[PDB]
């Protein structure tokens, strides 16, 4: 029931002494990095093209009297592609295909062949490769790849056989991906929120202390920081970014904290509990160090505009005469 301290839940009780410092450089640096990280015109066109082709082949297989009409219930676009949080260099989109039948390894490989053959017949000049995985399969062009996440209808889940069908974990994840996609589109489709999530993905990748943070946790954390506030109005990208560091530092994802509740599960699951106590400690003390590094005006370092910076979270640094000592482990056992 404990809600950690969050300044932007009670700004009124903290009147500013002087006028807010000018963070124009920080604001412009945030956008600049987003441009860096955002997919280019070619990438956007490749994944658009590939997803569209594949989606129609599947739309057609659903109402196309055959092996896969008695096999596929529906198909949903999910992931950063649908949300608009993709990152240049990783041109991969996800589709969840719900099977009516029990999902076996063979029905999956057969579905993959079917789909990659429809494409090859429509356009034999374009080179495609199709490989199956544990979660389903994926089709790759030379510029983009589309992942198909295979699952089945809920009635089927209570009737699986660990020896024949896919693992329940995978089937549940796919279904959850659809929930996350639906929730994100109704609640998290704001401009700033999308830019923040992209920037947060980059932050994690450059500070190993943030590794434990899952993508889904980043979506919620991104929506929370921007939207969840008294006024209800969206925060400025800069303010929301710093808030992201501040609420992690204040122990949002620590023991005893309500953290963020999963809006796609029941009844009141805490999304951060997927992490270990050791990892929670790490996420927190890594965010705590960055909170301080930011107050000293090290936004360019933190944003990835000045080479490696992962040491900033393990080494002593001095910022304009101020000796900064990284927050250290506290959890034991």
């Amino acid at each position: 029931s404990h809600i950690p301290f969050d300044f932007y839940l009670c700004e009124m009780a903290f009147p500013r002494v002087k006028p807010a410092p000018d963070e124009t450089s920080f604001s412009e640096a945030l956008l600049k990095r987003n441009q860096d990280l955002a997919p280019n015109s070619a990438e956007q066109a490749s994944i658009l093209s590939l997803v569209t082709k594949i989606n129609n082949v599947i739309d057609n297989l659903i109402v196309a009297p055959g092996t896969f009409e008695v096999q596929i219930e529906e198909v949903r676009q999910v992931g950063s592609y649908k949300k608009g949080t993709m990152t240049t260099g990783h041109n991969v989109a996800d589709l969840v295909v719900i099977l009516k039948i029990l999902p076996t390894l063979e029905a999956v490989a057969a579905l993959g062949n079917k789909v990659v053959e429809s494409l090859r017949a429509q356009d034999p000049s374009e080179v495609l490769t199709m490989l199956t995985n544990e979660t389903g399969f994926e089709i790759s062009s030379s510029d983009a790849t589309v992942k198909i996440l295979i699952t089945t209808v809920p009635p089927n889940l209570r009737k699986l056989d660990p020896e024949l069908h896919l693992d329940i974990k995978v089937l549940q994840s796919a279904l959850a991906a659809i929930r996350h996609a639906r929730w994100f589109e109704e609640n998290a489709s704001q401009s700033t929120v999308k830019v923040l999530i992209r920037l947060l993905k980059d932050l994690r990748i450059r500070f190993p202390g943030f590794e434990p943070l899952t993508p889904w946790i980043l979506d919620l954390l991104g929506h929370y920081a921007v939207m969840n506030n008294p006024t209800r109005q969206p925060l400025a990208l800069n303010v929301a970014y710093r808030r992201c560091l501040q609420i992690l530092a204040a122990g949002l994802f620590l023991p005893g904290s309500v953290g963020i509740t999963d809006p796609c599960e029941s009844g009141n699951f805490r999304v951060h509990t997927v992490m270990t106590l050791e990892q929670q400690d790490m996420v927190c003390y890594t965010a705590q160090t960055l909170v301080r590094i930011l107050s000293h005006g090290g936004f360019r370092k933190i944003l990835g505009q000045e080479g490696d910076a992962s040491y900033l979270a393990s080494e002593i640094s001095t910022w304009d005469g101020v000796i900064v000592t990284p927050s250290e482990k506290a959890y034991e056992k």
Binding site: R16, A250, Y285, V291, S295, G321, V324
Partner: protein
Amino acid sequence: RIFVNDDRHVMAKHSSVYPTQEELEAVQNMVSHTERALKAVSDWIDEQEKRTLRGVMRVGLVAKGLLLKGDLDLELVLLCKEKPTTALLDKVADNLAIQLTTVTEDKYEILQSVDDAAIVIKNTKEPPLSLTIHLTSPVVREEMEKVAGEDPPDVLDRQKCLAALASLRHAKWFQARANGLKSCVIVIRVLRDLCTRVPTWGPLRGWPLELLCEKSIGTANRPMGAGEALRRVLECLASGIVMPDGSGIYDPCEKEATDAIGHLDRQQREDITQSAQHALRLAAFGQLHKVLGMDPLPDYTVQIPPSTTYAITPRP
């Protein structure tokens, strides 16, 4: 509720720093003697061929109820009709010695400090209690104020007088805002001790620490036990509230916008924040006893009765 184990430790720690009944009896007596004697000094001045001394108010630790084991410093404020002069400081100090004999035989050492605009009284116990009477007048503020643009030759220091007035504002603010707040005074007492044994937290001691606790504990959506109320204070600090570019702590007792922690240099803010950030996770991972400098375990607002000599009119 929640954080039951932290409640225990913070409360077991509170007891270890709460003054002994022998300490409180002494303060209550000394304070009560100084008041009845100052009141008498007032009646005596008013009876000079016919007020000049408006009243005597408690401030600082005594008023707020933040006395702890080992505290020997008590404070009062003597409000004057006009700007206090060295001539008055002397007239009061002299008569105070006499008027004290009308209420007690206890020997008191009285030493006036014209440079502090105050009169200091020391008992003879061991170690001795030391109560400081600050002289000041509203006129001191008003003037300074109009200065904004808009007498006697031996008027006392104005800076000292303004500080005495400020101290009175704080005590009235504390009784109005922090006193009625569940666990606030408790958490302050315990953090005052932490500021004492941990030099890094030193610069927070006093007015800054009081405001901090009131704002962090106050902004909570519901009443908190000592354990959780304390963690909210650490969380607040952990978020970087006292960092340079932060909002700082807005002094609610100043006309002009003032930062209660504006005196902390950059390194100090850095050390305090980094410290609180570590204390937070220690508390989170069941090690708050370490934060409290204690081993793991196997009507709190009033310390002394309100004045009967002079009275003031006393959270929703």
